[PDB]
Structure 1
Amino acid sequence: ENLWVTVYYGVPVWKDAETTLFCASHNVWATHACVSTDPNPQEIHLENVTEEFNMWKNNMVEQMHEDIISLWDQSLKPCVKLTPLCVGLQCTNVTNNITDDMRGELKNCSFNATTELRNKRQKVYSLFYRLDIVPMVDLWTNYRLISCNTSAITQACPKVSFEPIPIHYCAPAGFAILKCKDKKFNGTGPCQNVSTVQCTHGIKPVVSTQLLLNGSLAEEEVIIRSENITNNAKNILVQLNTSVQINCTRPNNNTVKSIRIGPGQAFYYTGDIIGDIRQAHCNVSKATWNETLGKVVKQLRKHFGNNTIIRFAQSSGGDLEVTTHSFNCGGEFFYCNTSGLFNSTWSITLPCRIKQIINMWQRIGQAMYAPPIQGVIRCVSNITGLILTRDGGSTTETFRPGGGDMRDNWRSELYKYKVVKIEPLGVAPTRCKRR
């Protein structure tokens, strides 16, 4: 046909790409780091566009992970270090009324701390959780802080909230984010109801293990997502289509006192407890949870067999940070025992521990001291998904709560988004020639 090459600029095509995204949105996150969000939800549906997604090869997860860790470290860096408190403690039993489940959990410790002046010392009394102290043999002491033998303990800055707030990860111009608006989306493979957005809906950096809190719900049915469901070494992300409300509390009324440990420094500690001492706990409605697991096994049988028995069991062992359900509540860190939720074959109260000196990730060499919060803490949150691991062990599959790899927490979200690079240039044969 005597066709000629015609060059078109502004062609609606793209290629998969990895680029640097920026965030948009008294707090760890979105202090000054993030750009004010454009309030207009400029979402464009792409009719007849099928896009292949892979939530386990999504570089937005790696960027979200690095951004959260970086912001966490930036928040804690300009704060009071507790190296002057790495001294032996004289600890005795708490003299208040202790319930059966709190015997030895909390101890009344005393120590000689520094003051505003280098040449002075003060005797300080405080209540520490057993998890935060370890035995030591010394002259006039019994225990020392658990992290002083590993790394410096940094006190979190007071009045800087750890509450997760939605963060929007937005693409630079020349790039676009595609969303998969597909009900019951597998999390991998072609997605027909693709749409283009400038950026995400606002993802809360909620940190938890085993149970996914304050996330997004499935549009119609529970969705089982796994990189390779056959391989038991992979974690399974279960997105629920209904929330399960979990009510977590620390009923003790804490009286919080503070001391100076140097010029301009301050250390916060629990001074005493008002009322009886009770164990922290979470209440999960029994009927709702039973229906939730019924739905989960109903979905699992599609991959494991219509006639297979599915069993749930508690975690297999290891560090508290991964064997229990870790979460932030009111600024406090709860480590709840989930064996009451995953103990079955196909009101529930879960006891919880509180730990003030924590390692936020698997990395070793850093530690943070979470200051106590005055009063009584009660949180109401939605369980929106589960992290499950399949037992290696033949029939009757056994599932357990998963771990704390964090990427799983940031794959429950960001599984429907892909970043693509726009390629405005293209060529095509036309009948048009110069002159």
Structure 2
Amino acid sequence: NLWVTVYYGVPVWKDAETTLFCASDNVWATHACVPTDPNPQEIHLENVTEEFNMWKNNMVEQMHEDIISLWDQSLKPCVKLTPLCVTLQCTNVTNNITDDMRGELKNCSFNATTELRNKRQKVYSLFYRLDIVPMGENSTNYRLINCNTSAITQACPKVSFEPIPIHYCAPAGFAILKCKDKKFNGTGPCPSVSTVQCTHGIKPVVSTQLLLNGSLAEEEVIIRSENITNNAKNILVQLNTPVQINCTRPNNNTVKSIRIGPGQAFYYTGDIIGDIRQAHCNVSKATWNETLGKVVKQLRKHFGNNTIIRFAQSSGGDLEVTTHSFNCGGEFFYCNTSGLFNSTWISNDSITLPCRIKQIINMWQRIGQAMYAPPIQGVIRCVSNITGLILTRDTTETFRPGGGDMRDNWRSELYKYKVVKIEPLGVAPTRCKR
């Protein structure tokens, strides 16, 4: 009665993992990016319901590789600060230093190489205590932190670390499906799905426990976790309102440079103009308290309702995970958030967060690389939006800041996208025959 009829161009797809191509408009948006962002067309698929999943999306991994790679490429033409791995004799800074700065800075002198092999120069500079390690226990002799492990590369001063959005576009034969459900928690069926040519631009902002400058929830705080009852998993909390944070490094720095070799210039802080004060960030107190109250209300939908939710500071680990790390105007800050997560919730003031500054960082969770961030001339101020939190969990539930892994930051933006392969060929019975 019925016969097989072959159809080609059928609107069917299967999940697939392929390579996506970046499109943009200095480390980010390299020449390796098809210059477009044209009008990324969105074609609402109407009556389709697709099983979306973050915490499997391979787009997260591709972006991770890409970013790490772009970052490393930007250091390829830069000066290696290896001639400087020498004994640095150090003393205290001859200035007006507050108590919170004790000791925090050291005035270190050393014998540096120069342009001609038979010449040498005496150089001194100001180092943050976190970048140097005492040699011989209590002594004036100190070495740079990363001279016993990998060589440090100076970042090129002409290159800005400011995050530049990068759109991820599908190759022909593939499509990206976007979940538009405003209440979507990262997994399961998504009742409103549209097809897009390319994702929105995502800013590769690198921070830890407080996510900065991301997307906000449309209506309510959304708490997303791979398994909410599993204490080994992190919880990503997306806020529906930003919390403004104002960060500063209130010290007027004078930056000097020397030649350490043939066309190789090293930059360092020569001196400080004015008093020495601790770097810090401000969060409005009432705004922050309202923000946590909203988080608590949503946590109670997964945990008991007649419960107690307590917040606390990260319990341990290195500076990279116990603090809020971020890039503010090119400097690398490590802020103490114990002033934000110190309360118990049972059934125009501001909060000031002390911040440490480091010049020698590792960026990615790697051992074999180290970078020196040139100091920046003048005084630094930046303002950013807190758009989400990364929490971990211990009656009474206790939550603490987490965020050591970078993949999680990217998940907070890529959770709504899925990559599928188009499978245009198929068959069905019809009453027609040759």
RMSD: 1.4
The answer as to whether partners of 2:49 and 2:193 remain within 8 angstroms in 1 is yes
Q: Residue 412 of structure 1: SS of its match in structure 2?
A: helix
The answer as to whether partners of 1:114 and 1:262 remain within 8 angstroms in 2 is yes
Misfit runs of 4+, over 2 Å: 137-141
Q: What is the distance in 1 between the residues matched to 2:396 and 2:138?
A: 56
Q: Which residue of 1 aligns with 2:21?
A: 22
Tell me the CA shift for residue 30 of structure 1: 1.3
Q: What is the distance in 2 between the residues matched to 1:51 and 1:353?
A: 46
Tell me the CA shift for residue 80 of structure 1: 0.4
Tell me the CA shift for residue 113 of structure 1: 0.5
The answer as to whether partners of 2:29 and 2:165 remain within 8 angstroms in 1 is no
Tell me the CA shift for residue 96 of structure 1: 1.0
The answer as to whether partners of 1:323 and 1:403 remain within 8 angstroms in 2 is no
Gaps of 5+ in 1: none
Q: What is the distance in 2 between the residues matched to 1:48 and 1:305?
A: 36
Tell me the CA shift for residue 112 of structure 1: 0.7
Deviations 1:39-63 (A, max 9, x none): 2130111101001111000000000
Deviations 1:192-248 (A, max 9, x none): 110000111000001000000010000000000000000001000000000000011
Q: What is the distance in 1 between the residues matched to 2:428 and 2:64?
A: 42
Tell me the CA shift for residue 138 of structure 1: 10
Q: What is the distance in 1 between the residues matched to 2:119 and 2:137?
A: 22
Q: Which residue of 2 aligns with 1:47?
A: 46
Tell me the CA shift for residue 38 of structure 1: 3.3
Q: Residue 79 of structure 1: SS of its match in structure 2?
A: coil
Q: Which residue of 1 aligns with 2:384?
A: 381
Q: What is the distance in 2 between the residues matched to 1:293 and 1:196?
A: 35
Tell me the CA shift for residue 292 of structure 1: 0.3
Q: Which residue of 2 aligns with 1:365?
A: 368
Tell me the CA shift for residue 139 of structure 1: 13
The answer as to whether partners of 2:168 and 2:199 remain within 8 angstroms in 1 is yes
Deviations 1:249-285 (A, max 9, x none): 1010111011111111111100111111110000000
Q: What is the distance in 2 between the residues matched to 1:55 and 1:193?
A: 16
Q: Residue 398 of structure 1: SS of its match in structure 2?
A: strand
The answer as to whether partners of 1:88 and 1:141 remain within 8 angstroms in 2 is no
Q: What is the distance in 1 between the residues matched to 2:304 and 2:47?
A: 34
Tell me the CA shift for residue 4 of structure 1: 1.5
The 1:164/1:390 distance shift into structure 2, 3 A limit, reads same
The answer as to whether partners of 2:91 and 2:140 remain within 8 angstroms in 1 is no
Q: Residue 408 of structure 1: SS of its match in structure 2?
A: helix
The answer as to whether partners of 1:26 and 1:160 remain within 8 angstroms in 2 is no
Deviations 1:388-409 (A, max 9, x none): 0001xxx100000013200111
Tell me the CA shift for residue 26 of structure 1: 13
Q: Residue 200 of structure 1: SS of its match in structure 2?
A: coil
The 1:101/1:138 distance shift into structure 2, 3 A limit, reads closer
The 1:327/1:302 distance shift into structure 2, 3 A limit, reads same
The answer as to whether partners of 2:37 and 2:167 remain within 8 angstroms in 1 is no
Deviations 1:175-203 (A, max 9, x none): 00000001111110000110000111000
Deviations 1:277-312 (A, max 9, x none): 110000000000000000000000000111110000
Q: What is the distance in 1 between the residues matched to 2:101 and 2:66?
A: 38
Q: What is the distance in 1 between the residues matched to 2:183 and 2:176?
A: 20
Deviations 1:61-99 (A, max 9, x none): 000100010111111122100000000111111011101
Q: What is the distance in 2 between the residues matched to 1:326 and 1:183?
A: 29
Q: What is the distance in 2 between the residues matched to 1:345 and 1:180?
A: 35
The answer as to whether partners of 1:26 and 1:159 remain within 8 angstroms in 2 is no
How many residue pairs get matched?
430
Deviations 1:296-344 (A, max 9, x none): 0000000011111000000011110010000001011000000000010
Q: Residue 119 of structure 1: SS of its match in structure 2?
A: coil
Q: What is the distance in 2 between the residues matched to 1:364 and 1:316?
A: 23
The 1:140/1:290 distance shift into structure 2, 3 A limit, reads closer
Worse overlay, 235-244 or 419-428: 419-428
The 1:248/1:26 distance shift into structure 2, 3 A limit, reads farther
The answer as to whether partners of 1:208 and 1:404 remain within 8 angstroms in 2 is no
The 1:387/1:140 distance shift into structure 2, 3 A limit, reads closer
The answer as to whether partners of 2:161 and 2:330 remain within 8 angstroms in 1 is yes
The answer as to whether partners of 1:221 and 1:240 remain within 8 angstroms in 2 is yes
The 1:113/1:63 distance shift into structure 2, 3 A limit, reads same
Q: Residue 282 of structure 1: SS of its match in structure 2?
A: strand
The 1:15/1:84 distance shift into structure 2, 3 A limit, reads same
Gaps of 5+ in 2: none
Q: What is the distance in 1 between the residues matched to 2:25 and 2:140?
A: 38
Tell me the CA shift for residue 37 of structure 1: 2.1
Tell me the CA shift for residue 141 of structure 1: 5.0
Tell me the CA shift for residue 3 of structure 1: 1.4
The answer as to whether partners of 2:280 and 2:355 remain within 8 angstroms in 1 is yes
1:406 aligns with 2:389: no
Task: Report the TM-score when normalising by structure 2.
Answer: 0.97
Q: Percent identity at matched positions? A: 97
Q: What is the distance in 1 between the residues matched to 2:273 and 2:10?
A: 68
Q: What is the distance in 2 between the residues matched to 1:177 and 1:140?
A: 60
The answer as to whether partners of 2:20 and 2:170 remain within 8 angstroms in 1 is yes
Q: What is the distance in 2 between the residues matched to 1:249 and 1:155?
A: 23
Structure 1 segment 101-140 matched on structure 2, within 5 A: 101-137=100-136
The answer as to whether partners of 1:116 and 1:262 remain within 8 angstroms in 2 is yes
The answer as to whether partners of 2:174 and 2:422 remain within 8 angstroms in 1 is yes
Q: What is the distance in 2 between the residues matched to 1:38 and 1:257?
A: 41
